[PDB]
Amino acid sequence: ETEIMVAYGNQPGEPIDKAMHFWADKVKEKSNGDIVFKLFPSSQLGSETEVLEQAKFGANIITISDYGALMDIVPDLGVINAPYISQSFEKKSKLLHSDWFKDLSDKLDQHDIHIIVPDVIYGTRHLLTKKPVTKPSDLKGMKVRVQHSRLFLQTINAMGGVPTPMSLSDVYPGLSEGIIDGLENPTVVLFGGKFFEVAKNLNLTAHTKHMSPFVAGTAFWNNLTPEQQKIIVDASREMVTYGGGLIEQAENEALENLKKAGVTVNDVDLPAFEASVADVISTGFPEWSPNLYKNVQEKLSQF
Ligand SMILES: O=C(O)[C@@H](O)[C@H](O)[C@H](O)[C@@H](O)CO
Ligand SMILES: [Cl-]
Numbered sequence: 001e002t003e004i005m006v007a008y009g010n011q012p013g014e015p016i017d018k019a020m021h022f023w024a025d026k027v028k029e030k031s032n033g034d035i036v037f038k039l040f041p042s043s044q045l046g047s048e049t050e051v052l053e054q055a056k057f058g059a060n061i062i063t064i065s066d067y068g069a070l071m072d073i074v075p076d077l078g079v080i081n082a083p084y085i086s087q088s089f090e091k092k093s094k095l096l097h098s099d100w101f102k103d104l105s106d107k108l109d110q111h112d113i114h115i116i117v118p119d120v121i122y123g124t125r126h127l128l129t130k131k132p133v134t135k136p137s138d139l140k141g142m143k144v145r146v147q148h149s150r151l152f153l154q155t156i157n158a159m160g161g162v163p164t165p166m167s168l169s170d171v172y173p174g175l176s177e178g179i180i181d182g183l184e185n186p187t188v189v190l191f192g193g194k195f196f197e198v199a200k201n202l203n204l205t206a207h208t209k210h211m212s213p214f215v216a217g218t219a220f221w222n223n224l225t226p227e228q229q230k231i232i233v234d235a236s237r238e239m240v241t242y243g244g245g246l247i248e249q250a251e252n253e254a255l256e257n258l259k260k261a262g263v264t265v266n267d268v269d270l271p272a273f274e275a276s277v278a279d280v281i282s283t284g285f286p287e288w289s290p291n292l293y294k295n296v297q298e299k300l301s302q303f
Contacts, residue, residue: 002228006037006214007045007063009168011192015250016064016212017041019120019243026235035228037062047167049148055217056112062232064120065113065215068151074107075287078151079296083159083207083277089244091303092211093119100299114221115213117236121247122210123186126202128195128263130181133203135269136160136276145171145183150285155207156184158280159273168193175199186210187254188247196261203266205273 006024010016017039024037045051045061049069055061071078079085086092095101096118105115127133129142139161146152146163156163164180174180175198182199183190184207190196214236221229259265281293289295 001034001036002224003036003038003060004216005040005045005059005061007040007043007048007051007061009043009048009064010041010189012041014041014188014192015243015246016120016122018246019239022242023235023239026238027232030231030235031228035231043167043169047148047169049167052113052215055215055220058217058219060220062116062214062216065213066147066149066151067211067213068149069147070108070113070213070215071150071285071287073111073113074104075285076289076292077104077108078285079288079292081151081208081210082281082293082296083155084274085281085293085297086300087209088300088303089121089209089211091300092209093240094303095296095300096211098299100296109218112218113215114218115215116221116233117240118211118213119240120212120214121240121244122212123188123247123251124206125184125186125208125210126190127184127205127207128182128190128199129201129203130175130199132201132264132266133182133205133268134266135272142182143180145174145180152184152208154280154284155277158277158284159205159207160276171195172198187251187258191254191257191261196258196263200263201266202255202258202263203268205268206270207273207277 006020008016020039027035051063052065055063067077067080133139136159142161143164144156144161145166146156148165153163166174171183
């Protein structure tokens with residue numbers, strides 16, 4: 001049999017974890033045992049960035065990644081989750097099957113990473129902080145954690161905070177030790193990581209409707225048979241639809257779970273938060289093609 005390790009940062013029982021189990025079961029079933037996934041939640045194989053490195057070098061790994069992270073390699077991918085670019089997961093899904101996207105995925109393949117599935121719904125990212133945040137000025141001097149992603153570092157800087165890059169597994173002790181004052185993620189990820197134990201203000205900035213790729217190194221992926229590849233990709237499509245079902249009410253459920261555990265939920269000045277990123281989306285990523293955000297904003301509109 002062909003064993004593949006699946007890596008992500010989410011805790012057991014979270015939507016992404018349930019989706020990966022769905023994917024694993026389906027691949028095992030369709031391949032009659034020839035393809036098996038072994039799941040590694042909670043960053044067990046290492047940090048998200050570290051695992052991408054292991055994959056690129058040929059490890060038998062499929063790992064969640066991030067478009068904002070992948071923009072180190074193919075810059076234009078980073079616009080997919082650019083702040084406030086679209087409120088619609090469905091329109092993003094369409095974008096992620098467009099020729100504009102295909103060409104970027106083909107570019108990434110030549111840099112030794114392959115996107116197997118591009119459009120897993122991860123959820124709507126919100127700030128979780130020690131003190132309430134309702135407008136950008138409230139982030140003044142606040143050390144807000146971001147993952148290793150150029151897109152989110154620049155977004156949090158534009159929003160008014162002090163972006164502090166760190167791996168997901170270091171966030172909880174970072175909050176507890178006072179190294180950082182908050183982070184951002186979807187409710188299901190904030191609840192799963194128990195970050196509510198050390199940061200009790202959920203501020204509904206809703207800055208990213210986050211789409212997730214799962215990727216493998218081209219040097220491992222290309223040495224799979226075409227038949228194995230197709231089983232994995234066919235199954236991944238069903239996994240996306242299944243996860244869409246999981247996430248539909250899971251984000252509200254987690255919102256309620258957060259409140260029950262003592263988190264205060266703050267509405268924010270959304271027009272002020274959207275305004276705060278107007279410069280950064282236009283000229284803050286000099287490596288982007290000219291007018292990329294507005295181009296994609298508009299593509300998303302034909303949908
Ligand atoms: O906060 C984190 O480090 C994770 O929740 C990431 O945002 C997540 O794994 C994404 O990189 C996946 O697309
Ligand atoms: Cl990271």
